[PDB]
Amino acid sequence: NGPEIMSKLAGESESNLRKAFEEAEKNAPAIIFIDELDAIAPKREKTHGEVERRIVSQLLTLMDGLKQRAHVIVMAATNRPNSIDPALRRFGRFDREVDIGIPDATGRLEILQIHTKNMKLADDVDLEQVANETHGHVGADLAALCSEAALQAIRKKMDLIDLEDETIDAEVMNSLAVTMDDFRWALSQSNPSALRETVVEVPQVTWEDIGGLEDVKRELQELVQYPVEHPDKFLKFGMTPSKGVLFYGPPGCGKTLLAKAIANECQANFISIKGPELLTMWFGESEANVREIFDKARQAAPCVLFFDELDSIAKARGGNIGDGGGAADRVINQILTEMDGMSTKKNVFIIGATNRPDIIDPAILRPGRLDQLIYIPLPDEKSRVAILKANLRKSPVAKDVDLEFLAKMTNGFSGADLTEICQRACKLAIRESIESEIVPEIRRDHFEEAMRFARRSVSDNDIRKYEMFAQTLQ
Amino acid sequence: PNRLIVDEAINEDNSVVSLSQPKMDELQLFRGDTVLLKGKKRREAVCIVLSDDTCSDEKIRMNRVVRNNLRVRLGDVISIQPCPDVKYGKRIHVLPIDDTVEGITGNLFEVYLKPYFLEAYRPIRKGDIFLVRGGMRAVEFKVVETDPSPYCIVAPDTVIHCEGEPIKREDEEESLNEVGYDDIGGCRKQLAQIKEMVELPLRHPALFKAIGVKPPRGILLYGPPGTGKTLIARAVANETGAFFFLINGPEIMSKLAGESESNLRKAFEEAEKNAPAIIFIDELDAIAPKREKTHGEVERRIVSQLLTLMDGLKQRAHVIVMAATNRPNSIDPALRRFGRFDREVDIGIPDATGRLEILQIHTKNMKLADDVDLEQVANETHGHVGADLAALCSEAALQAIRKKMDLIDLEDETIDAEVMNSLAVTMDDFRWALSQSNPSALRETVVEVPQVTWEDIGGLEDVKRELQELVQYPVEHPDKFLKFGMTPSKGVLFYGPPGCGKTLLAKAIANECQANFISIKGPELLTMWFGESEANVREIFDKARQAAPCVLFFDELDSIAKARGGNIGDGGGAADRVINQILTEMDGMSTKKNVFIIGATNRPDIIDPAILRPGRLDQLIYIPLPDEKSRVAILKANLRKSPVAKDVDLEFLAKMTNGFSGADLTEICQRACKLAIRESIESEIVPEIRRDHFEEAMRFARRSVSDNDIRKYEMFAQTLQ
Amino acid sequence: TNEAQMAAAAALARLEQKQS
Ligand SMILES: Nc1ncnc2c1ncn2[C@@H]1O[C@H](COP(=O)(O)OP(=O)(O)O)[C@@H](O)[C@H]1O
Numbered sequence A: 001n002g003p004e005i006m007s008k009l010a011g012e013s014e015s016n017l018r019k020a021f022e023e024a025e026k027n028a029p030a031i032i033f034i035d036e037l038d039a040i041a042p043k044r045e046k047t048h049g050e051v052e053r054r055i056v057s058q059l060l061t062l063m064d065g066l067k068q069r070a071h072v073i074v075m076a077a078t079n080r081p082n083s084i085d086p087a088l089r090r091f092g093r094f095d096r097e098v099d100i101g102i103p104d105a106t107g108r109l110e111i112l113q114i115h116t117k118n119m120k121l122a123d124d125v126d127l128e129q130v131a132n133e134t135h136g137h138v139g140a141d142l143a144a145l146c147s148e149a150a151l152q153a154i155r156k157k158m159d160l161i162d163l164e165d166e167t168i169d170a171e172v173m174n175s176l177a178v179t180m181d182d183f184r185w186a187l188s189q190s191n192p193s194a195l196r197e198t199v200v201e202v203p204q205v206t207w208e209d210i211g212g213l214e215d216v217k218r219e220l221q222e223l224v225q226y227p228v229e230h231p232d233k234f235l236k237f238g239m240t241p242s243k244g245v246l247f248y249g250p251p252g253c254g255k256t257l258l259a260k261a262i263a264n265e266c267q268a269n270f271i272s273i274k275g276p277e278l279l280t281m282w283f284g285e286s287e288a289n290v291r292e293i294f295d296k297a298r299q300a301a302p303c304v305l306f307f308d309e310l311d312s313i314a315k316a317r318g319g320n321i322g323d324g325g326g327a328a329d330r331v332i333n334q335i336l337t338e339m340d341g342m343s344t345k346k347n348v349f350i351i352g353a354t355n356r357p358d359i360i361d362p363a364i365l366r367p368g369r370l371d372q373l374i375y376i377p378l379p380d381e382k383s384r385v386a387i388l389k390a391n392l393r394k395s396p397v398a399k400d401v402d403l404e405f406l407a408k409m410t411n412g413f414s415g416a417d418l419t420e421i422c423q424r425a426c427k428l429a430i431r432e433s434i435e436s437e438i439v440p441e442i443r444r445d446h447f448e449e450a451m452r453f454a455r456r457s458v459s460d461n462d463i464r465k466y467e468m469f470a471q472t473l474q
Numbered sequence B: 001p002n003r004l005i006v007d008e009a010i011n012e013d014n015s016v017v018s019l020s021q022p023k024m025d026e027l028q029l030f031r032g033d034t035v036l037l038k039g040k041k042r043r044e045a046v047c048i049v050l051s052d053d054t055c056s057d058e059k060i061r062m063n064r065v066v067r068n069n070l071r072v073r074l075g076d077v078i079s080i081q082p083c084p085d086v087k088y089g090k091r092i093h094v095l096p097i098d099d100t101v102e103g104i105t106g107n108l109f110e111v112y113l114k115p116y117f118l119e120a121y122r123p124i125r126k127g128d129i130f131l132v133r134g135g136m137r138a139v140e141f142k143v144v145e146t147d148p149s150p151y152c153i154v155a156p157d158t159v160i161h162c163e164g165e166p167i168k169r170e171d172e173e174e175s176l177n178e179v180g181y182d183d184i185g186g187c188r189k190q191l192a193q194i195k196e197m198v199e200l201p202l203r204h205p206a207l208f209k210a211i212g213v214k215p216p217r218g219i220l221l222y223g224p225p226g227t228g229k230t231l232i233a234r235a236v237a238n239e240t241g242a243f244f245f246l247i248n249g250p251e252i253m254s255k256l257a258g259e260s261e262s263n264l265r266k267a268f269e270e271a272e273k274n275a276p277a278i279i280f281i282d283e284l285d286a287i288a289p290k291r292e293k294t295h296g297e298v299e300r301r302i303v304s305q306l307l308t309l310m311d312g313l314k315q316r317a318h319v320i321v322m323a324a325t326n327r328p329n330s331i332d333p334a335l336r337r338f339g340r341f342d343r344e345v346d347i348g349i350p351d352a353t354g355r356l357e358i359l360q361i362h363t364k365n366m367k368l369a370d371d372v373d374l375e376q377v378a379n380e381t382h383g384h385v386g387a388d389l390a391a392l393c394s395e396a397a398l399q400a401i402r403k404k405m406d407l408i409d410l411e412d413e414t415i416d417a418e419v420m421n422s423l424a425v426t427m428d429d430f431r432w433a434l435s436q437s438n439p440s441a442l443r444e445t446v447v448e449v450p451q452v453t454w455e456d457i458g459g460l461e462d463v464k465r466e467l468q469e470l471v472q473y474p475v476e477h478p479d480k481f482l483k484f485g486m487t488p489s490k491g492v493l494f495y496g497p498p499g500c501g502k503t504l505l506a507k508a509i510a511n512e513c514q515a516n517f518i519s520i521k522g523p524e525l526l527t528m529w530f531g532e533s534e535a536n537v538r539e540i541f542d543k544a545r546q547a548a549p550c551v552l553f554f555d556e557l558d559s560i561a562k563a564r565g566g567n568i569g570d571g572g573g574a575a576d577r578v579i580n581q582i583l584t585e586m587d588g589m590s591t592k593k594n595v596f597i598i599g600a601t602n603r604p605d606i607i608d609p610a611i612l613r614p615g616r617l618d619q620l621i622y623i624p625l626p627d628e629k630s631r632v633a634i635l636k637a638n639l640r641k642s643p644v645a646k647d648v649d650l651e652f653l654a655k656m657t658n659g660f661s662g663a664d665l666t667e668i669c670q671r672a673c674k675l676a677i678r679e680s681i682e683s684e685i686v687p688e689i690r691r692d693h694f695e696e697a698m699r700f701a702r703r704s705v706s707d708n709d710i711r712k713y714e715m716f717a718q719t720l721q
Numbered sequence C: 001t002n003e004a005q006m007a008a009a010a011a012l013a014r015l016e017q018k019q020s
C-alpha cells in the first residue's frame, strides 16, 4: 500500500518494493496487490521531488521484470485510471484494467444479503427497501450500515440479558433479531461516500411509464435496437446506423423518459449528463472533462449517453442577445470532437434534449452526429388520458374520477403539468385521510380541487415557436 | 433479575437514582423507598429511588458519586434490591479527603458537613464517598465509622463527628473532581453520539470479540477553539477507563526529520501496550495537512506515517484514535477514507441554552447572590465558547474575593473555610467580567434549536398549518404518503415584503419538531461565487445532514441573480456556478435524513426558475404585510411579557399602521415598553404601560415598506394566479 | 417504609429547589 512504501526513507521505499517482487517469485504462483497506487506512482511531470521520480522508475522496472518472474501477477487499485503516471499502462505492465464502479440497486441488495448472512432478521425486515433507499452507497457503506443496525439491536438486548463475561452464550445471540426499525435507524445515521460520483446503471423506466408518443417509441427502437439485433440486415442493405438523435419541443413532455425507456428495454447503461454539469465545465474552463465522459460511455458500452439541456450554455450566454461570439464554445467543441472520433460499432447511442433548438450550434446536427430530429409536442387528448392513468398507478383512485373529462379540460397542459394534478390530488386525499383519524381513495373532489391550482406551464407564445420550427423541418 | 445498566442521571443528588416504572414494579418498590445497589469488588451503596420520563427500562440513572462508590463505570451492570428495614442512625464519623483539603483550614464540619446532613435525611453506608460543594471549593468526605451497620439514614438529631487528619485517597477510588461528562455543557447531542460509538468498544471488549461487528477506530471532532473538543476526548477516556494519550500537531512538527515520525509511532505502540486506550491528536490539520497543499517530502512523509498507523489499528486491539481540527476539510482526504477516521462529529459553537449550561457547570462551587441571572448572561454572551464562559465565571469569583475576603484574610496560601463560604458573587461581578472578556468565535455560524413557537407569529394562520403539513406529516403519517403514492416536497420558498415573519416561520416549525435551525445568508452565497469557492456549498448541505433533524434556511436567494446584475445584468439567464452546485446538493438530499429546506427572497421575480422545479423549492407561499386582524395580533403578542394598561387601544394603533410590517409593529410595542421602564426607574430617584407610552412611541416608529414595494409584491403574486 | 419516605421528601426538596 502507498503509505507503507512512501513513508520510508530514500533507499528503503525502493528496497521494500524490490523485496515484495522477490518474495512473490519465490512463492510463485503469487499475486501482488498494490493498494492506493496513485499514492506511490503519481504522474512524474506533476512532482518535483527526487523520491517520487525514483519510486515511479523503480515500480516500472519491477513491472517489466515480470517477464522473468514467471507466474506472478500484479494487481493494483486506484481511485481513477487517470491519477497515475501513464507509463504504467504501456503494453505489458498494467495493460489490463477493470472498472469496478458503484453497485446499483440490484448489487446493493446482494451486498446487504451477504453482510446479513449471520444476522437474524425479523419478519418485518425488507432489504429491498434498504437497497432502493441507499442511493450513492458502496459496499463498504452497506457493510457499515449492517454493523450499525446490528449494534442498535444488540444494545436493546444486551442491556437486559445481563451477561458480563469473555464469552456470550450461543442462545443469547440466537434470540437476538434485528428489526426494520434498526435498519431504518442506521440509514438515518450513515452517510454515503460515493453519492456525488457519477452513477451509471440500467434505468428502471419502462415504455408503459410514458403516455402517448407511440410513434416515437417505435422510432427509438429502430434507431437503438435494430442495429444490434439484426447487424447482418444492416450490412446486407448497406445501412449506416445513426449514432444519436436530438429531441426538441416544449419542456415536460417526456424527453428524459424516452431516453431512459429505450436504455431499459435494451438493457444498456444510461449515463445522465445534465445542464448544470455542462455549465460547470464551461464556467470553470474545464472542458477536458468532456473527454472523460465519452471515455466512460465507451467503457460502459452498450450504453445510452443522454445530454439534457443541450442549450444550457447558450441560455447562460443569453442566446436571444448573447455577446460578441457565436454559438460555439469550449464544451460543445469538445463534444463535437469526441463524437466524431467515436465508432458506431461500440454500441454507444447518444441522445440529446433541448427546449430551444433554434439556438443549438448547427455543428452538432451535421451528418455523422445528431443527424436525426424528433419533435415531442404537447400530448393530445388520448395521450393526456394515458398520462393520467400511468401517473395514478401508485395510488387508489375512486370510481367517480373521470380522467377523460379532465383530459378534455387540460388541453394546453404538458405531461409534467398532468403529473402535478395527480400528485396534488394525492396530497389532498392524504390530508383528508390524516384528518379522519383526529377517504381511503382519491375522490373526484380531489381532482376537481387540484384543477383550481394546476396551470399549463407552456403558453401559446412558445407553442407557436415549437410548431413553426417543426414545420420548417417538414 | 433486578440487574440494570449504569447510566448518567439528570438528578445531581448524592443519594438519588432514577428508574423507569416497569423496573420499579419488578423491584416491588414505590417512589421514595430506599434500595441497596451492589456493584463490583464487594462494594455497595444506599440510595432513594425516584422516576422520570427520560430513563429507559433497561438502565438505572445515577451520578458520579454513586458510580465511584460502587467502583463501576458507565455501561456496567449492578444489582438493585429494596431494603424497607432501613432505620435512622445514631452516631457517625465523617472525615474529608486530603485531595481536596489543600489551601483550606477552619471548621470544615460547620461549613460543609453540617449544612449537608442537617435535616437532609440522607441514607449513608460505611465507606461512602460524597461531595459537598461551597465556598468556591469542592470537598469530598468519607464515612469511616457508624454505630448502625452497614447503612443508616442520618436524621437531624444524630451526632456527627469530624476529628482527625484528612484521609489519603485509596487506590480503589478516584477523585470526584476529575474531568467527567458532567463537566461538559453544550453539545450534549454530540457527546451522546460519541458515547454510543466509543463506550462499548472500550468498556465491554468481550462484546466485539464475540459478536461479528466492527468497532469505530477513529473519530474526528471539529469546531472553533474553546468549544470542548479536547474536553470531550479526555472526559470519554476518564469515564470509560481507557488510557489517554495526548498528541498535537505543532509539537510533533517542531521536531527534526525522523524525530517526528518516531514520536508518532511510539504513541501508537504505547496505546497498544496500555490498551484499552484512546489516542487524541490535536490540530490534525497541522500534523497531517493536505498533501496536495504542501511541497516538501517531510510534510508528505508524516502524512503517510499517520495513514499507515491508522490502518495498523486493525491489529492494535481496543485502541481508538480521536482527532480535533478547526475545519473538517483542512486535513488530507485520505484520513477520512473507510477505516481510519471513518466517523466525525460536528461540535460547533454552543447556543444560548448550551452557554447557560456551561455557566452553571463552572459555578457549581460558587455561592451566587440572588441578583445573579446566568440566563441573562448566556443571552448576552453571543460569540462566546466554553473557554470564554469559564473565564467569565473565574473572573467573577476573583472580584468577589478581592472586594470582601482580602479585607478579612492574610496575604498567605491558607484561608479559613468559614470566610470562603461567607462570600457571595453578585451580578455586578459577572457584568464586570463580561466587559473584560471578548468572544473568540463571533464570526462563525452558530446552529441552534430555536425557541420561537407558533404563538410568537401574528397572522399567517394558514401558513403555519401549511408548514406542519409539509414538514411533520411526511414522517408522522408515512403510511398515507406511501398509500397514495405521493412524493413529499423537500422544501418551500417564501416571498414578499421584508419583516413579515419569514424567519419566525422557519424557526417555529423547527422548534415544534425539536430540530436544529441553520441560518444561511446571502453574503455567504455571494462570497462563494466571487471567490470561486463553491466547495463551501457542500459544507452547508453536509452540516445539515449532520445536524439532522434540522431546517436549512437559505435567505436572500436573489443574491445570486443580483450578483449577475439583478435589475440590469447581461442578456442571459440566472444560471451560474453557485446555484448549480446548490441545486445539485438539493437533488442528492433525501427526505429520509429529516432535513427540510426553506428559502426566502424579497425579489422573487429574479429567482432562477430551476430552484422551483419538482424536487426543489416547488412550493410557493406569499407572505404579505399583516392585515387589520393580523396587525392587532402582532401588537398583542409583543406585549405578552409586560402589563398593559386598560387605556391602551391596540386596535386604533393597528388601524393607523396600515403600511407597517410586523418588524415595525414590534418596534412600537418595544419602544412603549422602554418608555414605561424609563418612567418606572425615574419614580424611584410605572406598574404597566400606559396609553401615553404607546402614543409617544408612535412619534418615532415608521413604516419600512413603501407603497411602491407593496405593489411590486402584489403584482407578482397576481401573476402566479 | 416511613424513614425511607422522609429521606425521599428531603431529597425531593433539594432537587426541586435547585432545578426549579
Ligand atoms: N408522456 C409522458 N408520460 C408520463 N409522464 C410524463 C410525460 N411527459 C412528462 N411527464 C412527466 O413530467 C416529468 C418531467 O419529464 P422530463 O422528460 O424529465 O422533462 P425534461 O426532460 O424537460 O426535464 C416527468 O417526471 C414525468 O412524470
Ligand SMILES: Nc1ncnc2c1ncn2[C@@H]1O[C@H](COP(=O)(O)OP(=O)(O)O)[C@@H](O)[C@H]1O
Pocket (backbone or CB within 6 Å): B183, B184, B185, B186, B187, B225, B226, B227, B228, B229, B230, B231, B358, B361, B385, B386, B387, B388, B390
Ligand atoms: N463545551 C464545554 N463545556 C464545558 N466547559 C467547557 C467546554 N469547552 C470548554 N470548556 C472549558 O474551557 C476550558 C477549555 O480548555 P482546554 O481543555 O485546554 O480546551 P481547548 O482545547 O479549547 O484549549 C476548560 O476549563 C473547560 O472546562
Ligand SMILES: Nc1ncnc2c1ncn2[C@@H]1O[C@H](COP(=O)(O)OP(=O)(O)O)[C@@H](O)[C@H]1O
Pocket (backbone or CB within 6 Å): B456, B457, B458, B459, B497, B498, B499, B500, B501, B502, B503, B504, B634, B637, B661, B662, B663, B664, B666
Ligand atoms: N408576523 C410577525 N409576527 C410577530 N413579529 C414579527 C412578524 N414579522 C416580523 N416580526 C418581528 O420582526 C423581526 C424581524 O423578523 P424577520 O423575519 O427576521 O425579518 P427579515 O425579513 O428581515 O428576516 C422579528 O424579530 C419579529 O419580532
